[PDB]
Amino acid sequence: ELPKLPDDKVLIRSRSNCPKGKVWNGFDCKSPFAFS
């Protein structure tokens, strides 16, 4: 997938995915706990 918007599929921290129940940011797909 081109648009990083997963959670319960691959959630590859690599550089093109967002973990379970998370939220992207200027340059990172992850939970708000690490951004909010």
Question: N- to C-terminal Cα distance for the chain?
Answer: 26
- Check if the beta carbon of residue 10 is closer than 8 Å to that of residue 19: no
Supply 19's token pair. 């973990």
* Gaps after residue numbers in the chain (C–N over 2.5 angstroms): none
Give the total number of structural domains in the chain.
1
Give the method of determination: NMR
Structural domain of 35: 1-36
Place of tokens 């690599």: 14
Instruction: Write the Ramachandran bin of 6: left for phi over 0, alpha for psi from -120 to 50, otherwise beta.
Output: beta
Q: Running DSSP on this structure, what letter comes out for residue 27?
A: T
